[PDB]
Amino acid sequence: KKVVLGKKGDTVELTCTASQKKSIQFHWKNSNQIKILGNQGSFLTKGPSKLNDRADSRRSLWDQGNFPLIIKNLKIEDSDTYICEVEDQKEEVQLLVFGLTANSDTHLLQGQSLTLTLESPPGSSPSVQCRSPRGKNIQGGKTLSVSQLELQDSGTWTCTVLQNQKKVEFKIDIVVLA
Amino acid sequence: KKVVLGKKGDTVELTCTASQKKSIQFHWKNSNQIKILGNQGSFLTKGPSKLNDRADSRRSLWDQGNFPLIIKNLKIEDSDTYICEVEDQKEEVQLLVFGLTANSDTHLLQGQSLTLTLESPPGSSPSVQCRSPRGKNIQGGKTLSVSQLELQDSGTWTCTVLQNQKKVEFKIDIVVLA
């Protein structure tokens, strides 16, 4: 339903607003109906799941009817559909996690080729489109390449991943040396 | 409309959910219509106001239609009605800030009286009700007092401030010595 995009290693906050502003009853589960977190009494309980030590919520907001699921240090494998149920309300949020790495290690010399690769959830793939510090916008799919660099691209580029009308943005600084 | 209670020196997060999940146009102002924060383009702008260095929002949530106003290090004078307007939606949140201090400095001796006082927004007042580490629940208004303590109250008490169907909770540890 709602699509949220996140970046590998960053933290996301998936929202859940219900009615009757009050810490009433709710939980978040994943696609296999594994409960990730929910409220016990007025307490937060986290059962044993792959996200146990990386998930959490903001308890102060429960009185206002908000039950966020927060996930930190994202992994492409946290990509999944999550469901929030408050009393008798269900709310599906699909999280997609991507990563953009530069397989060109370090020390880049003029005339060298740059290759980037986008990491993505096996379940769903997008279109990436980067921009050099001075112009040219190379765009591709899971692998991008800039055949030969010129001292002018030394700088900080910006790639764009776009899934659903959503989008994330990575900015890497590349150093071309004479 | 929605009533949120906060504790002096703590941080609160006032919520604002609108529709069309997207960083569209919004701002938060106070009762004098002083804009506290809002979005410029895709950027956060804070104008000059008494809260400028203590307010903020969470930009990642704007794409999901959430525009929180976050306030830190609370002052009883931040108590006020705030309004969120997203496109053409208005949403009033009244924030009430209280404080509970122990005018009994330190070193409390058996048989001594304990006096607590609740600090509150000149505009609106509540009913406080504390609890000793072993029983008796003294309750009053802006000033509470425990005529004489007994080694048994050495511990950590819990006071309750209740405004609207809302409530905040302070827990102070008192030390009675022989």
Side-chain angles (χ1 to χ4, degrees), chain A residues 14 34 45 49 52 60-61 69 71 74-75 89 97 102-103 106 109 112 115 125 167 170:
Chain A
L14 269 34
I34 299 138
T45 54
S49 79
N52 190 269
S60 50
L61 308 189
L69 167 53
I71 301 168
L74 282 156
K75 275 173 195 29
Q89 161 200 297
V97 192
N103 279 192
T106 320
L109 301 133
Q112 262 199 262
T115 181
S125 318
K167 69 137 245 323
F170 301 85

PDB file of all heavy atoms in Angstrom, chain A residues 14 34 45 49 52 60-61 69 71 74-75 89 97 102-103 106 109 112 115 125 167 170:
ATOM      1  N   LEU A  14       8.723   3.583  10.087  1.00  0.00           N
ATOM      2  CA  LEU A  14       7.495   3.288   9.368  1.00  0.00           C
ATOM      3  C   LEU A  14       6.349   3.816  10.235  1.00  0.00           C
ATOM      4  O   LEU A  14       6.265   3.556  11.420  1.00  0.00           O
ATOM      5  CB  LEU A  14       7.382   1.794   9.222  1.00  0.00           C
ATOM      6  CG  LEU A  14       7.954   1.104   8.004  1.00  0.00           C
ATOM      7  CD1 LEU A  14       9.187   1.823   7.573  1.00  0.00           C
ATOM      8  CD2 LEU A  14       8.280  -0.359   8.275  1.00  0.00           C
ATOM      9  N   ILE A  34       5.105 -13.030  11.634  1.00  0.00           N
ATOM     10  CA  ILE A  34       5.982 -13.090  12.813  1.00  0.00           C
ATOM     11  C   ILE A  34       5.823 -11.752  13.560  1.00  0.00           C
ATOM     12  O   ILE A  34       6.142 -10.715  12.959  1.00  0.00           O
ATOM     13  CB  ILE A  34       7.455 -13.195  12.333  1.00  0.00           C
ATOM     14  CG1 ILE A  34       7.679 -14.461  11.513  1.00  0.00           C
ATOM     15  CG2 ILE A  34       8.415 -13.099  13.515  1.00  0.00           C
ATOM     16  CD1 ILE A  34       8.565 -14.235  10.268  1.00  0.00           C
ATOM     17  N   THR A  45       7.109  -4.978  24.055  1.00  0.00           N
ATOM     18  CA  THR A  45       7.700  -6.293  24.106  1.00  0.00           C
ATOM     19  C   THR A  45       8.252  -6.642  22.762  1.00  0.00           C
ATOM     20  O   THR A  45       7.570  -6.426  21.805  1.00  0.00           O
ATOM     21  CB  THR A  45       6.627  -7.331  24.403  1.00  0.00           C
ATOM     22  OG1 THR A  45       5.633  -7.104  23.398  1.00  0.00           O
ATOM     23  CG2 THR A  45       6.023  -7.176  25.784  1.00  0.00           C
ATOM     24  N   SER A  49      13.078 -12.415  16.808  1.00  0.00           N
ATOM     25  CA  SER A  49      12.888 -12.441  15.381  1.00  0.00           C
ATOM     26  C   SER A  49      14.184 -11.943  14.863  1.00  0.00           C
ATOM     27  O   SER A  49      14.972 -11.491  15.707  1.00  0.00           O
ATOM     28  CB  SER A  49      11.799 -11.487  14.939  1.00  0.00           C
ATOM     29  OG  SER A  49      12.298 -10.143  14.899  1.00  0.00           O
ATOM     30  N   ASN A  52      14.924  -8.400  16.180  1.00  0.00           N
ATOM     31  CA  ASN A  52      14.888  -8.066  17.596  1.00  0.00           C
ATOM     32  C   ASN A  52      15.860  -7.000  18.084  1.00  0.00           C
ATOM     33  O   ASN A  52      15.485  -6.035  18.754  1.00  0.00           O
ATOM     34  CB  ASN A  52      15.083  -9.316  18.472  1.00  0.00           C
ATOM     35  CG  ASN A  52      14.807  -9.027  19.944  1.00  0.00           C
ATOM     36  OD1 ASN A  52      15.686  -8.671  20.738  1.00  0.00           O
ATOM     37  ND2 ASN A  52      13.553  -9.132  20.363  1.00  0.00           N
ATOM     38  N   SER A  60       6.241   7.490  23.805  1.00  0.00           N
ATOM     39  CA  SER A  60       5.541   8.714  24.119  1.00  0.00           C
ATOM     40  C   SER A  60       4.481   9.050  23.133  1.00  0.00           C
ATOM     41  O   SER A  60       3.534   9.761  23.473  1.00  0.00           O
ATOM     42  CB  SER A  60       6.494   9.852  24.140  1.00  0.00           C
ATOM     43  OG  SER A  60       7.296   9.879  22.962  1.00  0.00           O
ATOM     44  N   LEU A  61       4.614   8.582  21.893  1.00  0.00           N
ATOM     45  CA  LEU A  61       3.611   8.912  20.907  1.00  0.00           C
ATOM     46  C   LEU A  61       2.409   8.010  20.985  1.00  0.00           C
ATOM     47  O   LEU A  61       1.435   8.312  20.299  1.00  0.00           O
ATOM     48  CB  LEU A  61       4.116   8.773  19.494  1.00  0.00           C
ATOM     49  CG  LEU A  61       5.388   9.453  19.133  1.00  0.00           C
ATOM     50  CD1 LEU A  61       5.576   9.353  17.653  1.00  0.00           C
ATOM     51  CD2 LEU A  61       5.319  10.913  19.495  1.00  0.00           C
ATOM     52  N   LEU A  69       7.244   1.772  13.894  1.00  0.00           N
ATOM     53  CA  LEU A  69       8.131   0.687  14.052  1.00  0.00           C
ATOM     54  C   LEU A  69       9.417   1.311  13.620  1.00  0.00           C
ATOM     55  O   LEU A  69       9.489   1.745  12.483  1.00  0.00           O
ATOM     56  CB  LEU A  69       7.857  -0.399  13.051  1.00  0.00           C
ATOM     57  CG  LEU A  69       8.917  -1.481  12.890  1.00  0.00           C
ATOM     58  CD1 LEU A  69       9.281  -2.125  14.219  1.00  0.00           C
ATOM     59  CD2 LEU A  69       8.414  -2.562  11.965  1.00  0.00           C
ATOM     60  N   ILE A  71      13.428   0.853  12.501  1.00  0.00           N
ATOM     61  CA  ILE A  71      14.421  -0.212  12.268  1.00  0.00           C
ATOM     62  C   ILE A  71      15.778   0.445  12.010  1.00  0.00           C
ATOM     63  O   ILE A  71      15.881   1.403  11.223  1.00  0.00           O
ATOM     64  CB  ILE A  71      14.018  -1.045  11.043  1.00  0.00           C
ATOM     65  CG1 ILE A  71      12.666  -1.674  11.218  1.00  0.00           C
ATOM     66  CG2 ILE A  71      15.009  -2.150  10.749  1.00  0.00           C
ATOM     67  CD1 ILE A  71      12.171  -2.242   9.882  1.00  0.00           C
ATOM     68  N   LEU A  74      19.998  -0.722   8.507  1.00  0.00           N
ATOM     69  CA  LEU A  74      19.250  -1.552   7.568  1.00  0.00           C
ATOM     70  C   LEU A  74      20.056  -2.521   6.710  1.00  0.00           C
ATOM     71  O   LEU A  74      21.190  -2.210   6.307  1.00  0.00           O
ATOM     72  CB  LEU A  74      18.386  -0.723   6.638  1.00  0.00           C
ATOM     73  CG  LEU A  74      17.087  -0.179   7.203  1.00  0.00           C
ATOM     74  CD1 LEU A  74      16.671   1.050   6.398  1.00  0.00           C
ATOM     75  CD2 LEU A  74      15.980  -1.217   7.196  1.00  0.00           C
ATOM     76  N   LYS A  75      19.416  -3.711   6.455  1.00  0.00           N
ATOM     77  CA  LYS A  75      19.939  -4.799   5.665  1.00  0.00           C
ATOM     78  C   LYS A  75      19.028  -4.972   4.459  1.00  0.00           C
ATOM     79  O   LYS A  75      17.833  -4.837   4.573  1.00  0.00           O
ATOM     80  CB  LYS A  75      19.882  -6.087   6.476  1.00  0.00           C
ATOM     81  CG  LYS A  75      21.108  -6.208   7.354  1.00  0.00           C
ATOM     82  CD  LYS A  75      21.049  -7.388   8.337  1.00  0.00           C
ATOM     83  CE  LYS A  75      22.113  -7.264   9.456  1.00  0.00           C
ATOM     84  NZ  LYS A  75      22.475  -5.872   9.785  1.00  0.00           N
ATOM     85  N   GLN A  89      -7.707  -2.295  13.285  1.00  0.00           N
ATOM     86  CA  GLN A  89      -7.312  -1.608  12.072  1.00  0.00           C
ATOM     87  C   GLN A  89      -6.047  -2.260  11.549  1.00  0.00           C
ATOM     88  O   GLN A  89      -5.151  -2.552  12.330  1.00  0.00           O
ATOM     89  CB  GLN A  89      -6.980  -0.148  12.323  1.00  0.00           C
ATOM     90  CG  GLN A  89      -6.128   0.405  11.161  1.00  0.00           C
ATOM     91  CD  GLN A  89      -5.274   1.687  11.356  1.00  0.00           C
ATOM     92  OE1 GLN A  89      -5.811   2.784  11.613  1.00  0.00           O
ATOM     93  NE2 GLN A  89      -3.934   1.578  11.154  1.00  0.00           N
ATOM     94  N   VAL A  97      14.643  -1.902   0.663  1.00  0.00           N
ATOM     95  CA  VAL A  97      15.973  -1.396   1.000  1.00  0.00           C
ATOM     96  C   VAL A  97      17.028  -1.572  -0.108  1.00  0.00           C
ATOM     97  O   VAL A  97      17.345  -2.638  -0.601  1.00  0.00           O
ATOM     98  CB  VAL A  97      16.446  -2.021   2.323  1.00  0.00           C
ATOM     99  CG1 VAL A  97      17.680  -1.282   2.845  1.00  0.00           C
ATOM    100  CG2 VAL A  97      15.305  -1.965   3.333  1.00  0.00           C
ATOM    101  N   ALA A 102      30.496   1.504  -4.526  1.00  0.00           N
ATOM    102  CA  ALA A 102      31.429   1.817  -5.614  1.00  0.00           C
ATOM    103  C   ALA A 102      32.511   0.756  -5.668  1.00  0.00           C
ATOM    104  O   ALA A 102      33.465   0.809  -4.891  1.00  0.00           O
ATOM    105  CB  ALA A 102      32.149   3.135  -5.411  1.00  0.00           C
ATOM    106  N   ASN A 103      32.320  -0.235  -6.580  1.00  0.00           N
ATOM    107  CA  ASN A 103      33.244  -1.358  -6.779  1.00  0.00           C
ATOM    108  C   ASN A 103      34.612  -0.901  -7.279  1.00  0.00           C
ATOM    109  O   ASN A 103      35.438  -1.744  -7.634  1.00  0.00           O
ATOM    110  CB  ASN A 103      32.684  -2.364  -7.797  1.00  0.00           C
ATOM    111  CG  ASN A 103      31.653  -3.359  -7.233  1.00  0.00           C
ATOM    112  OD1 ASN A 103      31.276  -4.352  -7.870  1.00  0.00           O
ATOM    113  ND2 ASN A 103      31.142  -3.136  -6.018  1.00  0.00           N
ATOM    114  N   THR A 106      39.555   2.499  -4.342  1.00  0.00           N
ATOM    115  CA  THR A 106      39.940   3.863  -4.093  1.00  0.00           C
ATOM    116  C   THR A 106      41.075   4.275  -4.999  1.00  0.00           C
ATOM    117  O   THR A 106      41.526   3.490  -5.836  1.00  0.00           O
ATOM    118  CB  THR A 106      40.267   4.078  -2.617  1.00  0.00           C
ATOM    119  OG1 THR A 106      39.287   3.321  -1.905  1.00  0.00           O
ATOM    120  CG2 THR A 106      40.159   5.544  -2.212  1.00  0.00           C
ATOM    121  N   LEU A 109      42.305   7.252 -11.061  1.00  0.00           N
ATOM    122  CA  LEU A 109      43.154   8.064 -11.930  1.00  0.00           C
ATOM    123  C   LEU A 109      42.473   8.576 -13.192  1.00  0.00           C
ATOM    124  O   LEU A 109      41.621   7.938 -13.819  1.00  0.00           O
ATOM    125  CB  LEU A 109      44.376   7.241 -12.305  1.00  0.00           C
ATOM    126  CG  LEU A 109      45.229   6.774 -11.136  1.00  0.00           C
ATOM    127  CD1 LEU A 109      45.580   5.301 -11.260  1.00  0.00           C
ATOM    128  CD2 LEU A 109      46.472   7.643 -11.053  1.00  0.00           C
ATOM    129  N   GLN A 112      40.298   6.703 -15.955  1.00  0.00           N
ATOM    130  CA  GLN A 112      39.861   5.379 -15.480  1.00  0.00           C
ATOM    131  C   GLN A 112      38.338   5.184 -15.548  1.00  0.00           C
ATOM    132  O   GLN A 112      37.558   6.128 -15.534  1.00  0.00           O
ATOM    133  CB  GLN A 112      40.336   5.121 -14.042  1.00  0.00           C
ATOM    134  CG  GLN A 112      41.600   4.285 -13.945  1.00  0.00           C
ATOM    135  CD  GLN A 112      41.793   3.659 -12.569  1.00  0.00           C
ATOM    136  OE1 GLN A 112      42.533   4.147 -11.678  1.00  0.00           O
ATOM    137  NE2 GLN A 112      41.118   2.542 -12.352  1.00  0.00           N
ATOM    138  N   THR A 115      32.843   2.116 -11.922  1.00  0.00           N
ATOM    139  CA  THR A 115      31.698   1.231 -11.935  1.00  0.00           C
ATOM    140  C   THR A 115      30.963   1.188 -10.568  1.00  0.00           C
ATOM    141  O   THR A 115      31.539   1.047  -9.484  1.00  0.00           O
ATOM    142  CB  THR A 115      32.140  -0.154 -12.408  1.00  0.00           C
ATOM    143  OG1 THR A 115      30.964  -0.934 -12.414  1.00  0.00           O
ATOM    144  CG2 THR A 115      33.170  -0.804 -11.508  1.00  0.00           C
ATOM    145  N   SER A 125      12.709  -4.525  -8.423  1.00  0.00           N
ATOM    146  CA  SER A 125      13.870  -3.772  -8.875  1.00  0.00           C
ATOM    147  C   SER A 125      13.570  -2.468  -9.661  1.00  0.00           C
ATOM    148  O   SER A 125      12.558  -2.305 -10.364  1.00  0.00           O
ATOM    149  CB  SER A 125      14.752  -4.735  -9.670  1.00  0.00           C
ATOM    150  OG  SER A 125      14.833  -6.023  -9.041  1.00  0.00           O
ATOM    151  N   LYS A 167      11.598   7.541  -3.930  1.00  0.00           N
ATOM    152  CA  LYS A 167      12.987   7.664  -4.297  1.00  0.00           C
ATOM    153  C   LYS A 167      13.945   7.965  -3.148  1.00  0.00           C
ATOM    154  O   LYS A 167      13.651   8.643  -2.180  1.00  0.00           O
ATOM    155  CB  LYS A 167      13.135   8.678  -5.416  1.00  0.00           C
ATOM    156  CG  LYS A 167      12.861  10.105  -5.013  1.00  0.00           C
ATOM    157  CD  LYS A 167      13.931  10.959  -5.662  1.00  0.00           C
ATOM    158  CE  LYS A 167      14.780  11.570  -4.566  1.00  0.00           C
ATOM    159  NZ  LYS A 167      13.948  11.911  -3.423  1.00  0.00           N
ATOM    160  N   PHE A 170      21.734   8.683  -3.107  1.00  0.00           N
ATOM    161  CA  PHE A 170      23.032   8.429  -2.497  1.00  0.00           C
ATOM    162  C   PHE A 170      24.036   9.431  -3.000  1.00  0.00           C
ATOM    163  O   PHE A 170      23.992   9.815  -4.151  1.00  0.00           O
ATOM    164  CB  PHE A 170      23.519   7.035  -2.857  1.00  0.00           C
ATOM    165  CG  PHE A 170      22.568   5.934  -2.424  1.00  0.00           C
ATOM    166  CD1 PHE A 170      21.519   5.581  -3.230  1.00  0.00           C
ATOM    167  CD2 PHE A 170      22.836   5.201  -1.277  1.00  0.00           C
ATOM    168  CE1 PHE A 170      20.755   4.481  -2.894  1.00  0.00           C
ATOM    169  CE2 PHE A 170      22.073   4.097  -0.942  1.00  0.00           C
ATOM    170  CZ  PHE A 170      21.029   3.738  -1.760  1.00  0.00           C
TER     171      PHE A 170
END
